[PDB]
Amino acid sequence: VISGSPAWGLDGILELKEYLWFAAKQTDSYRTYQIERGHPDVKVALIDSGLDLDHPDLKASVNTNGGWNYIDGKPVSGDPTGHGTQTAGMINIIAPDVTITPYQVLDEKGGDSYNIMKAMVDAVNDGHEVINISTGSYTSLDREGKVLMKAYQRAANYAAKHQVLVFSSAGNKGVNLDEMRKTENKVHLPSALKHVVSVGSNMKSNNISPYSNQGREIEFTAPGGYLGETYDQDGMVRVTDLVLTTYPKGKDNTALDQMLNIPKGYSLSYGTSLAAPQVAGTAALVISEYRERHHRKPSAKQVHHILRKSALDLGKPGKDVIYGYGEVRAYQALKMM
C-alpha cells in the first residue's frame, strides 16, 4: 500500500529517488526488500579505501569489529577519499542487511597490489562469502609483471578453493583489454585473473558506459552511469545519467551535488567501481536466499550460475566482449530461484 523506497534515508528528500534509478531497476522498485533483504551473517569484504563507519545508511551493516587498515596497520577509522564508502553504498542499496567489512588497502597515494592480495586472503580466512575489489592496476607483463600476476592468481585460486566469490571492476579507460594486451603487453589486475569476475558499467539506456573497459574477460555489467550518453562528444552533462552514492557524511560533496541540493552523505558519481559492488550485493542476496531455503551454503558456482542465467543479454546475442553475459538484475536473480 506504500510505494517502495530505497533503504537509504536520503535525509527524507523524496526527489533524491530520481538519482537512484539504477537501484529501482536492480530491485524492481525495491520489491526485493520484501523478497530477500540479505542476512547479517552473510559477509561481503570491501577491499577499498576504508569506510565511513558511522554513515547513517551503512552503520547498521558495518562489521561490528570494524576492519583492518593495511596501510597503517591499524583498525579502520574512516575513509579519507570517500571511494570505499561509495562502493559500500552500492552493496548496501541492493542488500541492506548483509554485513560489510572494510579492508582498507587504498588511500590518497593509491595502493599496493600486495595489500590487495593480503586482504583477499584474510577476507577468505575471516569467513566472507563475497569479495568486492573496486580498483585495479594496469600491469606490464615483463618478468616482474608476470610474477605479480602469478602471485595474484594464487590469491584468486585461494578464494575459489574456499567457495568465495570475487567481483572486480573492469576499469574505466574505455579500451579493449584484449587489444591492450597484444599492443601494450599490459593486463588489468585483478579483473583479468581466473576466478575473478570482471564487471563493466552500463547506462540507464543499457548502452555500455563509454569509459567501460571491454574484452573477453568481462563477465557482467551493472548500471554505473556516466556524465551523459554523448557527453564525450557534446560536452553536455545529463545528471539523470549519473548514479547516487553514499559519501562520507562529514566530507563536503561536489558543486554539482550542492547545486542539485544533494545533502552531505550522498554524491552523484559514475564508474565500474560502482558497477562491481551491485553484482557483489546481488551475489550476497542470492547466498542469503539460498541459505534461507536449504540451510546449506551454495557453491560459488551455484551463485555464479544464478547470476549468469538471470542477466539481461545485451549487444550481440550471447557472451560478448562489451557486456559479458549481460546486465545483472537482482530481482531477476531472486525470481529465478
Binding site: 616482474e144 602471485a151 590469491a155
Partner: protein, 61 residues
Amino acid sequence: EQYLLLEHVKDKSKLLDTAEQFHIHADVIEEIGFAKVTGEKQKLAPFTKKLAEKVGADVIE
C-alpha cells in the same frame, strides 16, 4: 623494499630464517607464499643471494 614469490609455500619458514640472519623484515602472505621484504638495501642483495641457494623464489624490484 622488494617482493618475493616462493615456488613452494612450505618454504616460508626457510625464508623467515634467512631474513632474520640478515636483519631484514620479511612479511609473508603464507597461503600464497608471497612476501614483502624491507630492510637495508645493501643487504637485500646478499639476502636474495643466500635465500637463492636453498629455496626457489622469484624477486621483484
